[PDB]
Amino acid sequence: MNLTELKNTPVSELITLGENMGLENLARMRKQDIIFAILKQHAKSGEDIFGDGVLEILQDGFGFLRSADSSYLAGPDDIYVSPSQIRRFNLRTGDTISGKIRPPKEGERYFALLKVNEVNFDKPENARNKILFENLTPLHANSRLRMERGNGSTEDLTARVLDLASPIGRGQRGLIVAPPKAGKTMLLQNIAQSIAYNHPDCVLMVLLIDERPEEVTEMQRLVKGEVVASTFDEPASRHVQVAEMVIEKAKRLVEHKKDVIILLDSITRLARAYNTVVPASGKVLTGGVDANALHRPKRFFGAARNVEEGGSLTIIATALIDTGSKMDEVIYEEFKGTGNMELHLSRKIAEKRVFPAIDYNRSGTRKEELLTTQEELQKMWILRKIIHPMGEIDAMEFLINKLAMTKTNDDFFEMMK
Amino acid sequence: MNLTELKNTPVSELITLGENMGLENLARMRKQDIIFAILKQHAKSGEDIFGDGVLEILQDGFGFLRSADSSYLAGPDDIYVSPSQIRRFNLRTGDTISGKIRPPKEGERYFALLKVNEVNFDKPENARNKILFENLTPLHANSRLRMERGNGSTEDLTARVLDLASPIGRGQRGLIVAPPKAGKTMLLQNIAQSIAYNHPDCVLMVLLIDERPEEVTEMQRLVKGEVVASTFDEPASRHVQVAEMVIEKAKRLVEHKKDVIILLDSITRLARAYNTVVPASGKVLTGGVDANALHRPKRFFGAARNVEEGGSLTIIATALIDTGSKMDEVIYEEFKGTGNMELHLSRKIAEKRVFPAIDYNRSGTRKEELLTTQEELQKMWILRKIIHPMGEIDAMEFLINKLAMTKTNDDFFEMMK
Amino acid sequence: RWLELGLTDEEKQNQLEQLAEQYDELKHEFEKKLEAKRRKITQGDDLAP
Ligand SMILES: Nc1ncnc2c1ncn2[C@@H]1O[C@H](COP(=O)(O)OP(=O)(O)O)[C@@H](O)[C@H]1O
Ligand SMILES: Nc1ncnc2c1ncn2[C@@H]1O[C@H](COP(=O)(O)OP(=O)(O)O)[C@@H](O)[C@H]1O
Ligand code: BEF
Ligand code: BEF
Ligand SMILES: [Mg+2]
Ligand SMILES: [Mg+2]
């Protein structure tokens, strides 16, 4: 029996199945131990059990295989793995494992793994002959990501603006600078829809840290991807745990020659969690910030790169400004000269209800010559020269108003002449 | 005999009844043990006894049923419940129980429960087949709360301003940012009166933490609701106890498909109580704050949501600023990007005696499109555009002066054109 | 473990409730005797000044 099958089931179907099995009232307790108990029963009377998830190594040597629907949380759903696997197949933190499991025997409460069927959607034999992550040779953005769908709906134009404001490719670092109440949420939503529609081949992951559960719920069932998130009713331990697990999963997946693109919103809340979870090293900055509290966020942001040997990792993290604290400014200043794809969203345009509010003049992308052709980049330069002397609001006014009538971006370039 | 009957009686009537019974002088001691002793007598010679309250589970397995008029406090008024009930009906922390009780026998001092008559105003059979709280599917605000009464008295206009400044619906999170001496007390009072007058179907609860007893007294007998509060002459244990009990009661009640709306003033004092009651975890923030001291307040604030399956939970917590401490700013900064309904009360307008002092420019509500019609929200946008370029004081001056003559809000929208 | 059911409430559930109440009283009395014997055999003895 597969675990992900009972995973994609709602709680009501689990309740109905447990009542069909004729047991103690299972609807009373957690979905976690609901699945645990129904699995224990169906495995008392049932086949080999099958399961899948992502592995995290403990300091005891053993490992835990956890689910992304539980956002990689500790509980009875986890699969225990022995260090003997981590010696035989030499398992690692963040490996996508899928294999056979069994009930725990006398005194045990965690399902034990039997035989690894797929390691990162690949062969264990081929799991040995792999390349290390930092041992790779990074490179600039080589292949551009097509965000324009070509239909021109009410929201798709938003993505089109990006296609002429800051082109993104596999291996690029994107950083969004926006104050609160600027419309970045559905900005990432439309971006994710477009990159999932245009490229169903690259595995797409999003990250929500200290976000409201409403957006988490509406996102985890609207776009494609293992939509993993971290709500604010948990301490910084869980947030940094999601950070570790998904960043290691992306690292292993690009090591397996796959293009991974990670959507984070926001990087400032994650860095604040990093600060409040890391022990104090004596050196305080302005606003209660540790110098070592930015080391791991810098690692998380710089993990993205464009591999020469194969695969790529592109990160798009959003940053908050203009919200008053000391940490927001110190973090945004520390991260300004890090990413090579700035996207500035000025609230001065969002206050006029002109969406998307994009600061085209203060935005840009370095090494953008390796993403578009000569005439494409030339048209981009000419339009930037045309719109730069204009202000902010009127700039986006002209951009959106002229992209409203024409429907393909190259046609917009043509008509702009 | 019902307990709530003797509960709603003043102390003088209890004294008269005890003297009519011909016993030792009962007026000498607590209302608590006054009711205890008169119940012991009337139950020595009387029917089955009846009682009602909210249940809290102890770490011994048993539970205590307490009263909200005593703000869920420990004392002789409590009803002892055995773990056998918590196995049979599987009782829970925060269940509204009402059932039959008896005097305690030899050596016992707590009234024992006999048979549960109503569990959360519902059937115990139907108390099994229920849905778990976090297992629910949250959603955005779907149904808007009508705060306008339509009479236009001296204070009702205050609520009307909210109806055009930040619309609230079932499941929304409201956070009030106001310095001391800004008129938030009767702001919540008028809001509670309006939502109790317009919607007598949803159970309405308020929360006062570290508040003066005068406001507690004047509130517990002016509006409808189980007005539970926590005065500062008790330590943080009692305050966090009220927090637990009423939040669990609201959770169970929305689990029973009921709309619960919780009024808290203020969230900063409750968070300070949480900080001073939680043990230190080593990590200190600016101002003696624990990182884990905000975890449970964040849980309390994020518990509110709009359920898809049925019922809803809306929280309106007030926050204090500009009072000098480190905790107030760190807490308000931590809670800024949490709530989706900001209400800013600037003291700069309250100093001019212009009530209500509402920062309309710095206030707003996300996902406000799911609460009003197209033309309503359009008129809201046009008026926001009209009043935004104005200052603060003059903005509220114009708002209040133009809402003074017209009496219905849509008529105000019409006349504003 | 399933003393509790439901059918023809008006009198059947009344008798079942009377029985459940008697059972709860019996369990409470047994727990009282248990704790009494416990505190009796575990109380601090007096030996000498
Ligand atoms: N493409 C759009 N069309 C219409 N309205 C929009 C569009 N984008 C944003 N909005 C408006 O902006 C608001 C966005 O709210 P929110 O997602 O909280 O903004 P942010 O994510 O920037 O904080 C909504 O109330 C919506 O009415
Ligand atoms: N709607 C109103 N109607 C009449 N008086 C009001 C109103 N709102 C505020 N006030 C005045 O403001 C004062 C409120 O004090 P208080 O409730 O302690 O404010 P805060 O809680 O902000 O310190 C009262 O003396 C009252 O005269
Ligand atoms: F989601 Be908003 F930008 F706070
Ligand atoms: F209640 Be006041 F604002 F001190
Ligand atoms: Mg947003
Ligand atoms: Mg006050």
Swiss-Prot record, chains A, B:
PANTHER family: TRANSCRIPTION TERMINATION FACTOR RHO. Facilitates transcription termination by a mechanism that involves Rho binding to the nascent RNA, activation of Rho's RNA-dependent ATPase activity, and release of the mRNA from the DNA template. RNA-dependent NTPase which utilizes all four ribonucleoside triphosphates as substrates. Changing residue 202 to G/S: Does not affect the kinetics of ATP hydrolysis and inhibition by bicyclomycin. Keywords: ATP-binding, Helicase, Hydrolase, Nucleotide-binding, RNA-binding, Transcription, Transcription regulation, Transcription termination. Residues 284-288 are annotated as: RNA-binding 2. SUPFAM superfamilies: Nucleic acid-binding proteins, P-loop containing nucleoside triphosphate hydrolases, Rho N-terminal domain-like. InterPro entries: AAA+_ATPase, ATPase_F1/V1/A1_a/bsu_nucl-bd, CSD, NA-bd_OB-fold, P-loop_NTPase, Rho-like_N, Rho_factor_ATP-bd, Rho_N_sf. The keyword Protein transport does not apply. This is Transcription termination factor Rho. One of its GO terms (cellular component) is cytosol. Residues 48-123 form the Rho RNA-BD domain. It holds the Pfam family Rho_RNA_bind. It comes from Escherichia coli (strain K12).
UniProtKB/Swiss-Prot annotation, chain C:
The modification N6-acetyllysine is found at residue 27. DNA-dependent RNA polymerase catalyzes the transcription of DNA into RNA using the four ribonucleoside triphosphates as substrates. Belongs to the RNA polymerase beta chain family. The RNAP catalytic core consists of 2 alpha, 1 beta, 1 beta' and 1 omega subunit. When a sigma factor is associated with the core the holoenzyme is formed, which can initiate transcription. This is DNA-directed RNA polymerase subunit beta. The gene is rpoB.
